[PDB]
Amino acid sequence: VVGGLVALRGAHPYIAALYWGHSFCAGSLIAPCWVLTAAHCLQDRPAPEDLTVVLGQERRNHSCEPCQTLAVRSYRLHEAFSPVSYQHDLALLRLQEDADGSCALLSPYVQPVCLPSGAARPSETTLCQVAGWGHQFEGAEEYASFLQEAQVPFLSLERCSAPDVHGSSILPGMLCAGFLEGGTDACQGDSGGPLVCEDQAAERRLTLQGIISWGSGCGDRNKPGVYTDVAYYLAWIREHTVS
Amino acid sequence: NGPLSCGQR
Ligand SMILES: *[B]([O])([O])C1=[C][C]=[C]C(C2=[C]C3=[C][C]=NC([N])=C3[C]=[C]2)=[C]1
Numbered sequence: 001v002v003g004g005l006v007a008l009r010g011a012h013p014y015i016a017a018l019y020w021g022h023s024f025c026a027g028s029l030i031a032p033c034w035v036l037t038a039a040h041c042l043q044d045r046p047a048p049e050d051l052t053v054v055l056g057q058e059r060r061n062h063s064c065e066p067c068q069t070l071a072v073r074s075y076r077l078h079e080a081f082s083p084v085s086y087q088h089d090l091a092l093l094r095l096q097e098d099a100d101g102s103c104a105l106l107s108p109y110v111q112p113v114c115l116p117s118g119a120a121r122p123s124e125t126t127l128c129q130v131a132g133w134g135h136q137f138e139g140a141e142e143y144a145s146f147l148q149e150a151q152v153p154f155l156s157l158e159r160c161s162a163p164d165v166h167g168s169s170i171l172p173g174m175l176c177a178g179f180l181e182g183g184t185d186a187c188q189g190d191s192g193g194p195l196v197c198e199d200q201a202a203e204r205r206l207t208l209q210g211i212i213s214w215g216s217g218c219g220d221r222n223k224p225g226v227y228t229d230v231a232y233y234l235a236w237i238r239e240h241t242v243s
Numbered sequence: 244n245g246p247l248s249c250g251q252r
Contacts, residue, residue, distance in 0.1 A: 115249065117251055201252060202249070202251060202252065203247060203249065203250055
C-alpha cells in the first residue's frame with residue numbers, strides 16, 4: 001500500500017496470507033474455517049493442495065510465534081467472476097480442520113472480522129483502513145516485509161462512476177475508496193486485501209466492506225482503488241459458507 | 244469475556 005505506515009502487531013488479527021507456487025495474495029478471516037479473498041488471485045485455478053494459508057502473520061513469509069499455518073480443503077470462485085471486468089471479484093477459501101475439528105486457532109493475533117451490515121446506506125464520510133504487503137510506491141522493486149495500513153475515505157458509486165473518476169468501468173458489486181487527490185492507496189501485491197470501514201450501527205463499529213480488487217497505478221491523482229463491495233454479496237457468502 | 248457481537252447495536 002502507498003501512503004501508509006507499518007501496522008501494529010495486534011492491529012490486524014483478521015488478515016490472512018496466502019502462498020502457493022510463486023504467487024501471493026491476502027484475504028480476510030470471516031469465520032474460523034473461512035477466508036474471503038479476491039477471485040482474480042485464483043484466476044489460474046491452482047490445486048487446494050498447493051495452497052498454504054498463514055494466519056497471524058506480521059512479516060510477509062516470516063515465521064513468527066503467533067503465526068498459524070493451514071491447508072486449504074477447497075475454494076469457490078464467484079460463478080460470475082470475469083477476469084476482464086473484474087466484476088464479482090471474490091472467492092471463499094475453506095480451511096482444513098485438524099484432528100480436533102478446529103481450523104483457525106483464535107487468539108489476540110488471530111480472530112475473524114465482522115461481516116458488513118449491508119442494509120445501511122453507504123456514505124462518502126465513512127472512513128476505512130486498507131492493509132497489505134504489496135508495493136509501497138509505484139515502480140517499487142519488492143513487496144513490503146512488514147504489513148502496511150493506510151486510512152482512506154469511502155467513495156460513492158455515483159462519484160466513482162463519474163467520467164472524471166473511473167466512468168463506465170465501475171459496475172454493480174464494486175466500490176471505491178481513496179482520495180481523488182491521490183497519495184493513499186492499495187497497489188500491486190495487495191490483491192485480496194481487506195478494506196475495513198467505520199460502521200456506526202455496528203457493536204464493533206468496524207466491518208469488512210471491501211476486498212482489494214483493482215485500480216490504475218499506485219496512488220495516482222484522481223484514481224481511487226476499486227474494491228469488491230462485500231455487503232453486496234452477503235447472501236452469496238451466507239449461502240456458500242454453510243457448505 | 245466472550246466474543247463481542249458482530250450485530251447492529
Ligand atoms: B495482486 O497482488 O494480485 C495485484 C496485481 C496487480 C494489481 C493489483 C492492484 C493494483 C492497484 C493499483 C492502484 N490501485 C489499486 N486499488 C490497485 C489494486 C490492486 C493487485
